[PDB]
């Protein structure tokens, strides 16, 4: 739901896999278990928790308070029923569905948000219900269930972009676009950060900036950064919060690897141990390394091992297998030679290859018109 | 309507009286004319609907449409009940 139990119950990923940080997460998880009816979530995740000595103590009180508030919402729902009104029943069934989102059961909340989803008098409240399914779909990490109601609720708005409704939906677009590895279309989502604000429901503003600094810092090139973020004053405002981000932006834009590799361990450790950002930690590292190697190797034709080893601050034995794996695996530039122990590329990728970029569509289009010949007579 | 009633002596005519909107007729028209624009979650439609007397239901439309301009002037995201009270003072002053 929109309560802090989304984040407190969202720390279960770092509570589960590492055994070092599993103390504070169970500290504020057990301390916060008396809030927002956290019984069923931590009872389901009880295998990743402590023993049953203190566990069975509060279950008897939470299981009866759940039934008490549940039957009070049922009595209030019966008092709202059989009466002339639309928003009253929407608030009763919607509040019952919010409590069922607090307990963490999407069966009665699925049929509840289905009933109040069918009682939507307007499309705005319908999109509000959709968002009410997205706030729990983040915890449930479902793929299609959160894209179905947004695919259906996306079209036919006709009421214009609000200040926090459309902006909040764009925030959700940033969420599911951070989950997926789509970057060239997700680089446009965070442009509305001027109107964004501290949203305790899903993600804090500093966490939204901390999450978009990866897709913006890696998924964008130097003209894209200079146009979008360097020209914009937003990163100039939010760089004063943490001095590290300014180092990872001015050091990357300044092409200083001696400090970027010494400070990259913080990006490595911080990159993992996250709810939605951990399983993609392998792609950001390699993509950023090949992006930096294409950045330095773009303006440089030939490169000696001395200036390269001093620039990157690493041994030649490692860059040997690096470029050796990035010739075939990376496929960044032409073949490299070591007849003089000097990185020397040619890159004839403009004159003839600029015309040869269409031969792939010529061969695939050739097989597609062979398919067109296959449609003949049958 | 007097001359028309002299020409229409209730022979074949549906006589439905059109009264000024009552309290509930101000809550429901306040909702129909409040869903179109922003609205906070800490407002009570009961008292703010009971504080809109006068001619007819177009006075509520005067509060809303003559309150969005104060939302624009104030440069806020939504509209509070105090702004609606200011629009009440405005349309009541105009009355």
């Amino acid at each position: 739901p929109k309560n802090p139990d989304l984040r407190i119950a969202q720390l279960r990923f770092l509570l589960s896999l590492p055994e070092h940080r599993g103390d504070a997460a169970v500290r504020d998880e057990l301390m916060a278990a008396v809030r927002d009816n956290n019984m069923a979530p931590y009872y389901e995740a009880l295998c990743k928790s402590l023993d049953w000595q203190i566990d069975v103590d509060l279950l008897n009180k939470m299981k009866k308070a759940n039934e008490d508030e549940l039957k009070r919402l049922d009595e209030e729902l019966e008092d709202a029923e059989k009466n002339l009104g639309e928003s009253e029943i929407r608030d009763a069934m919607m509040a019952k569905a919010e409590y069922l989102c607090r307990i963490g059961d999407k069966e009665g909340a699925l049929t509840a948000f289905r009933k109040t989803y069918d009682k939507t008098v307007a499309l705005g409240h319908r999109l509000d219900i959709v968002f009410y399914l997205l706030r729990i779909g983040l915890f449930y990490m479902d793929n299609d269930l959160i894209t179905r109601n947004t695919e259906k609720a996306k079209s036919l708005i006709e009421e214009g972009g609000d200040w926090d409704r459309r902006n909040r939906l764009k925030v959700y677009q940033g969420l599911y676009c951070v989950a997926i590895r789509d970057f060239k279309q997700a680089a446009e989502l965070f442009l509305d950060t001027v109107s964004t604000f501290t949203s305790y429901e899903l993600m804090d503003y500093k966490t939204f900036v901390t999450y978009t600094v990866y897709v913006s810092m890696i998924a964008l090139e130097r003209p894209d950064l200079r146009e979008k973020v360097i020209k914009g004053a937003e990163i100039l405002e939010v760089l004063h919060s943490l001095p590290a981000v300014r180092q990872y932006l001015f050091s990357l834009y300044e092409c200083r690897y001696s400090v970027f590799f010494q400070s990259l361990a913080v990006v490595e450790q911080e990159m993992k141990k996250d709810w939605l950002f951990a399983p993609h930690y392998r792609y950001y590292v390699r993509e950023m390394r090949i992006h930096a190697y294409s950045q330095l190797l773009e303006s440089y034709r030939s490169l000696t091992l001395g200036y390269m080893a001093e620039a990157f601050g690493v041994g030649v034995e490692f860059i040997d297998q690096e470029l050796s794996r990035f010739i075939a695996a990376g496929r960044l530039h032409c073949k490299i030679d070591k007849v003089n122990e000097i990185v020397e590329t040619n890159r004839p990728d403009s004159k003839n290859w600029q015309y040869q970029e269409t031969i792939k569509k010529g061969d695939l289009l050739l097989n597609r018109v062979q398919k067109l010949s296959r449609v003949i007579n049958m | 309507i007097l001359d028309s009633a002299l020409l229409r002596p209730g022979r074949i005519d549906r006589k439905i009286e059109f009264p000024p909107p009552n309290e509930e007729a101000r809550l429901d028209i306040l909702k129909i004319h409040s869903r179109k624009m922003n609205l906070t979650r800490g407002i009570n439609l009961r008292k703010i609907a009971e504080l809109m007397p006068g001619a007819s239901g177009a006075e509520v439309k005067g509060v809303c449409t003559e309150a969005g301009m104060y939302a624009l002037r104030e440069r806020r995201v939504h509209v509070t009940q105090e702004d609606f009270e200011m629009a009440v003072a405005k349309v009541m002053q105009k009355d």
């Binding site: - | 179109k36 922003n38 969005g68 624009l72």
Partner: peptide, 28 residues
Amino acid sequence: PMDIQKQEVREAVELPLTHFELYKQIGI
């Protein structure tokens, strides 16, 4: 091929003019 028409024309005319999509985001 005053101040009533200056304030009224002011806020009703030039304030919507110097901003875009306000017709969409003011409750048209």
